[PDB]
Amino acid sequence: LIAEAVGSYDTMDLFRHTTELNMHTEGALGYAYWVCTTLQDKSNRETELYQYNILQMNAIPAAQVILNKYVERIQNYAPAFTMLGYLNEHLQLKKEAANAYQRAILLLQTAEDQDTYNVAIRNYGRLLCSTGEYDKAIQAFKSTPLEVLEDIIGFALALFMKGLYKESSKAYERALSIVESEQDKAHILTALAITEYKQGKTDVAKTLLFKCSILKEPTTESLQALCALGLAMQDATLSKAALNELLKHIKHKDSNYQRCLLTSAIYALQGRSVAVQKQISKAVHSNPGDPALWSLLSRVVAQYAQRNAKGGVVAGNVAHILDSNHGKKALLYTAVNQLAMGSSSAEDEKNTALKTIQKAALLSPGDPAIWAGLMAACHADDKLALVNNTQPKRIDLYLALLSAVSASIKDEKFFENYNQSLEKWSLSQAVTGLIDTGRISEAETLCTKNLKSNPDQPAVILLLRQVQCKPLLESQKPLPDAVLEELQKTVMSNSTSVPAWQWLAHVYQSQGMMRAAEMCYRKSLQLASQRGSWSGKLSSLLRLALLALKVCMANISNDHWPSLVQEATTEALKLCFCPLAVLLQALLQFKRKMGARETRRLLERVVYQPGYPKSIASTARWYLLRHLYAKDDYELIDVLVNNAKTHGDTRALELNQRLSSQ
């Protein structure tokens, strides 16, 4: 106290020492006052007074605990309550700050009635509006003279939150009347544009934002709103101008992430869809720190141009490494990228898709994406294990995951389109998984329950068709044209979806309508190519080639299927280096005019050049062994035997044993 009276410089430290000794009341109030006063002065945050003391001795939490003890001890003094509210506001404990201000309001009614009571009212109302309870905020803002900028602004924002947009516009206009500090005028103009927009009436918003732009110096706030308004519209012409203006003469913005997002969104608007990733790559090159940028690069590569899966995986891992609290999003994006990749790895444990998605699920079990990712991971793992042929695992858990997805979605604020898409996708994947595992009854009941909710939507009915027609066509059976026509009608209902069409063509192939199945595949290929998608195009093309080759296999006449095979394989090789396509060409040549030289050469080069999958190599090896047996050369046969030995094989050598002694 003596040091404070004579105005020294180490009074704050003396109060801190007193706080550390034994919690007396007077020292408690002194320390809280000094912490709040130090926080006010905004020329401090390089001094090593503010930085060390406040941010490295955890002054704020100590002050909060001290004030709680003091306030419960005395509880008839208002400034203590207001100081407690202020500190709680800096800790983002908003509910407790609201309680503190409420008690301060109760204390201060019948003593002063001056500005202090009004300021306490505005603070309580503002904070109450910050966390729900908008009607209470409006009621509190009623009981004050709405004559200063602060109260009017708080009233306006509470009104905007509840609705009543016209009222908010009027309140903001009144606040605009009494304005100094032109920065605030620009902010009020931007708020006007934002609030009136939600009514519609976009043109007045646009012109008003230009009116704000005419001020002496831009504010870095109105420009961002202008760009977002352009994106809410289409034809991003003003948007480009706004972005250029923002970059030109504004450098004091220190986010560096919002600017990248706006630039990427602008490029996405024109449908370019590859530049986006290039631009984000440029931004991450500029500032190789800032994990957020690496994470956003991973997300964009996952969404747009999903052919750089390896780069995306690396970017997500780097984003995760350089910090910890970005764990959630970076792990989610790397898991999805690994899903997209496939299994192009060294068959290493502890780094498959399942492991990373499980890690993310443990980090934040709140968002709805992680659970859908988990379902996709389980299905992909099942298929991969089936290919390796050891054991299918993780059989029956889909229903629980779907329930988790829906329950998590229920608490999400608003991304309406995104939430609808997520729920729909989870439903579709769960039904398909249940159909695959073999639990037809549960899939059927789930679909019926979903359809009972609402009138028909042409997507779910196709799922019900799929569950119905799985038992039959499994065992060979002949179906009547009525059922076939209804299924055709159902697929036609919901078009612009390559899966459905491919599945129906598979149905045709199963019952047997070859040319018709070829037509359905051709329609699917055209749809995929027109969509700008890339996986669907190749998938449809290779599937059609397989269809033609298999139907030819039976040594059928009408030698036209090989021509279709030739055309499809040429297109596939034009796009990429599909090993299956080249093996398919070799098999077609071998089947038609079995012959001696060209077929053997192509097969042997295929089975000798490295960089090929195991199964395709095995198939080519086995057929070449048969052809080599046809055109006798025992040396080469022993060459094949040793080639089998230096690897692991069961069937090629076994056939060789079978046919060495016929």
Binding site: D13, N53, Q56, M57
Partner: protein
Amino acid sequence: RCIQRLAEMCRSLRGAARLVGEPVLGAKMETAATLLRRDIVFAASLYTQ
């Protein structure tokens, strides 16, 4: 031996900085001590436990 004889003084100064009334030396001496002793320099004795 020198580091072991230093970590016993950067902890006896924590006892005096609280006594003089210097709450800023305490928050530095309880860091310079916990930041100094981690490994084979301070490995526990064998015939002690």
